[PDB]
Symmetry: C3
């Protein structure tokens, strides 16, 4: 009864779908670092040099491409020197944005950078422009990357790291329109131009610089930043949260009806319009697309769970959140020439997390499983997938009934992702494949019995992928019986 037709053009390959679209984001916020990543060398939670083993293994298994640290709003007040040297001598600071709680600085530059090397991931460092003078980020970059025998390099060596680390991405201010200094873009562009000057790449590696970009539909911000500074940036950040009910976040993460379901998906899909319009502005100043659009905060933002400190942003992660992730990956992959990095907010225990921990307990969220399903998209080639779908309507809201994307992976196999956004109606999908003879199709499905299903320590697999039985090939057509509220990932052979 819901019928979806489409075309896959394997013969019209497009741009690389960057692995950096699967970036993570670990702010010093709530238990995102302390408990979520760092437990300390003396913890009875099994750990490697203080990093909990369960989280390390889980993040390695989805091949995290980069982690942005330490913020976020925290980064615009962070002083990197507070986080180096003997732990006993590091100052206790106040985390002003996120509960006004004490920050021990036990997890600092060496602990984060060595964590990235343990995962085999890239570091995306967020520098302080709002409350520091430019010399702070200049010295931080030298400390981390200098191969010479300068005082800062020698101080890194004294602190136990002989060789430079790689710092491939460096954010030059975070949310400058808000928590980073309430700046008009005219002022922020001047500040960016100045502060970026003093972050210099040594001969031995290139540090790419990400300029502070718009929130939501702030097109004026993009216009000015690009007009004034496009020659001085390697990327421009944009931020868009999916916030059912609007700001401030009051929607339940655990308990919701179909109206809240469709509203959430409707809001998340706005990402496509935002990327389109911000990209078009970037094209006016940067037609060769040298500057990446960097979506370095996205995801859902709900009411805090009952009983939790609201400054710690703890929320559950349901099937709804899985669909949010699949729809955003689809959208990013459709804009792959310009959108070359993204970072979901946030990695562990905060906002739309991969993982929830509580002492030695750990659970993988439905969102984690979507990152796992879409692993073949990492550094794949975009393929055009054009779907002819009816709308799913509930009350005064409508969204596409089915959404999807496709790639040719580095192993040479074609993958098709499909999502059925309808809370109760299945769909029959028929995709005509051009440019590749088919014999077979294998797949996995992520769904659950109810839209509001989430994983817990006691029921860790309520939402988890299983083998999918509803895909078949006939002639040049892939036919899919796609259940309500589900995501499938199909591999053609």
């Amino acid at each position: 009864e819901v019928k979806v037709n489409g075309t896959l053009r394997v013969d019209q390959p497009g741009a690389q779908v960057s692995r950096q679209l699967f970036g993570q984001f670990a702010e010093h916020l709530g238990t995102g670092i302390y408990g979520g990543v760092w437990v300390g060398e003396e913890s009875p939670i099994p750990n490697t040099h203080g990093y909990r083993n369960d989280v390390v293994a889980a993040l390695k298994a989805i091949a995290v491409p980069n982690i942005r640290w330490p913020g976020g709003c925290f980064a615009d007040e962070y002083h990197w020197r507070d986080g180096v040297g003997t732990p006993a001598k590091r100052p206790i600071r106040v985390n002003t944005h996120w509960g006004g709680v004490e920050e021990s600085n036990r997890f600092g530059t060496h602990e984060f950078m060595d964590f990235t090397e343990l995962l085999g991931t890239q570091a995306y460092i967020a520098g302080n422009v709002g409350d520091a003078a430019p010399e702070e980020i200049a010295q931080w970059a030298e400390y981390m990357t200098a191969p010479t025998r300068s005082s800062l390099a020698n101080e890194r060596r004294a602190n136990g790291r002989d060789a430079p680390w790689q710092v491939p991405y460096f954010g030059v201010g975070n949310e400058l329109w808000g928590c980073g200094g309430n700046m008009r873009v005219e002022y922020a562009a001047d500040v960016f131009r100045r502060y970026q000057t003093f972050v210099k790449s040594p001969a031995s590696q290139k540090i790419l610089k990400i300029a502070p970009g718009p929130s939501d539909d702030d097109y004026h911000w993009t216009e000015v930043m690009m007009r004034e500074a496009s020659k001085f940036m390697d990327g421009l950040s944009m931020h868009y949260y999916t916030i059912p009910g609007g700001w401030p976040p009051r929607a339940s993460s655990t308990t919701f009806d179909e109206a809240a379901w469709i509203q959430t998906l409707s809001r998340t899909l706005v990402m496509d319009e935002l990327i389109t319009k911000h990209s078009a502005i970037m094209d006016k100043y940067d037609p060769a697309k040298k500057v990446a659009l960097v979506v370095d905060e996205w995801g859902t933002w709900y009411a805090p769970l009952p009983g939790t400190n609201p400054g710690f942003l703890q929320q559950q992660n349901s099937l709804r959140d899985a669909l949010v992730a699949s729809l955003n990956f689809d959208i990013f992959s459709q804009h792959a020439e310009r959108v070359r990095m993204a970072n979901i907010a946030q990695m562990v225990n905060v906002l739309q997390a991969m993982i929830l921990t509580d002492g030695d307990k750990m659970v993988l969220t439905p969102t984690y499983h979507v990152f796992a399903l879409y692993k073949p998209y990492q550094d794949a080639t975009h393929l055009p997938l054009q779907l002819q779908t009816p709308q799913y309507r509930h009350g005064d809201t409508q969204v596409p009934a089915v959404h999807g994307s496709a790639v040719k992976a580095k192993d040479g196999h074609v993958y098709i992702a499909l999502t059925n956004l309808d809370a109760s109606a299945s769909a029959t999908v028929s995709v005509q494949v051009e440019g590749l003879p088919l014999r077979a199709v294998e797949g996995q499905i992520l769904t659950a019995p109810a839209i509001a299903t989430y994983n817990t320590y006691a029921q860790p697999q309520a939402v988890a992928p299983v083998a999918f039985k509803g895909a078949r090939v006939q002639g040049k057509t892939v036919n899919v019986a796609l259940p309500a509220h589900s995501i499938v990932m199909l591999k053609l052979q």
Copy 2:
């Protein structure tokens, strides 16, 4: 010499109570300047000048007696170059700095954060802290606020504790830059608004107290400054500062504080009255962006500025304080109280030994100025209720200058009594003032008068009460009328039963 007596008629509407006249209109201002801090307030624990923890006792008692509501510190121009860490920790380890604006003399930093904040607690007054925006990065004021107010066991809070203060202090007002159009960085307002927006971001209130933020506002009639600061930043400020000095003869200040004729008298009063026009016009601009009046207009520098006294360091701004200065203060209090919905803070420049001071000291000697006595007379205005007082007054004219012959204001005080202030601006003519009182049955009136035999009279160590308030016998009640025989060059404060 002689001038004929004048008639003034007026109406007092006790039945039309208006806005609260904030006690913060009586704010003081103690910059690190000349002997305003060193000698004027701080003598050190080992001084032979009688002192409590290094604060001279005589000044403490005098300031307590006028119920100082807040003190702004440490500037002024000094604040835009001050580094708060220079003023904390063991005194011998604090650096000696240079007071660049005010004589280029050494600043010992012996009077720093702890000494000022503990002084405010000794007086029972509020701290109005002036933060450095001009020559510091924003992290300095951010850390300063944490040091002073954090209740947690952060390193900065523990440093405050190490330096002898366990509990946080209260920091109810925080200035985010001082005179940014001038000594704070010669900024165009368009740039200052961006800088203010940025620096204010990082001054955060802990959960335990609210720190109000005062934005750097206009000098004199710089309406463009108010327009841009309000247009660009009104949502980020609790107050906007304005500055207006009374400078007879204009800048640079060359008029004598001790010796003057009637032309200089009326010129000074004419110039001081311009405050009303400035407040009116700056308020109207603020109304366009902030019609609910959430942002206070903060007059945080006002008062007279004269030539320095002969033989003094001109960078120390030492001037005498005469009957003329008393009238300047009474006229300004009248004006502020007429604008009480918007003007909710003011700070006279400056508290001890500097500009229009409350107190002058010289070693163990201390004298209370005529201006001090006006703060004392107007104490009942603190947190009082404004009452409309309309006066129909002739002009006082001398040469090509004219001012109202009589000026005044009224309140209903928290003690429940109605008070009426009247000032006769005429250097030689007495006035008969007849006030029709509505909404209050009249039984009795008493009062005090501040005057002197000559306009150019001031207080000295040798003649400490040449200008000082005494019982006033020239008010009478009849029916619904208060009749006042108001001498030339005088201020009266009347209390109705």
Copy 3:
């Protein structure tokens, strides 16, 4: 065949030709400081307290009027505190612009300032605006100049200097349009206004403040800086390099034909148009001419010599460079009412140097000899000299065949400088002198047998001044037989 007629008006004296037009510029760059000036107390190169003796003597002999230090691009990242205190405790920094090499900071504030006193020259200090807060330059000025017992003054005393030094000129940012923070002028004007506020003169001496001005023909920069900030500056800097072939610098400093000769002189003469047009803008906002135009970078910029580190800007210095210097001195002296300071880039071993060193070897360049010839111009009086000259043409380029200038010196004598720009043709110059009875004339000539002649350690006097015998007086006329490619300086009795 080439005949030039002129008129000298000794009876119409003009403005003072400031000695500061002969300023030098010593950036921390290559071997300009380390090797070129500072060898260290432990060096076998003969030295006085670490300053090499040969360079000290040579610079004293041309009466250097001021030296600008320490940059240049280096100055916008320099932290003065790194260069004071016990040498063992000073941090090693990175010279990011000029090879990414280590900077020991052994040559710091005391070493530079005591060097200026040894030479009897003035210090022109270049302050950090780009990457520092304003408190740094404020404290630096106090450290150097405070006569009080402030902590900064006491620290100078502890470091071995009891009395203040004189700091007569202070640059408030360097190249803010580029290496100093990539600032548009509207932002730079706001930054200058703010930072200059906090550089204060003590009662005991006046510190003049130089505002960051235009590169080349950036008239918009001059317009905005003067419109917004002329009341806060004692001088406005301008920069103009003579770069044959254009940016990036690829022309040989050693080997060139007549086309490259005339192209270089044509490019250097553009200085006159730039000064004219920048001066006219300054006149609109500063009609009294209170603000000096300060040419604090000029000179030739060539390809780096073979085998050298390209970040050290090492080039040779030929007869062509001598004529560049004489033409620039002529031009500056014609604009002496407004142009009151200039600094050639750079003093030793860098760009159009006075001196080249290599270990204990030292050579004086052709450019040095032009500074020597023009010594009588120091604090002289400008005299109007009108020359009617044919053009020198080679291919599609033309320049005046002869160029010159004249002064009445403080020694009471009139001096006339003439340059023959032609690579091969001599000129006959006839100057009618008004307002001075003529008795005799003598002079010196700087030339060489070939245009591409330069000085080396093996041939240190290939280009050096000798007595000139080709001037004679007849009636009221000075007649000069002026050789091809030559500079003469004539002294009238």
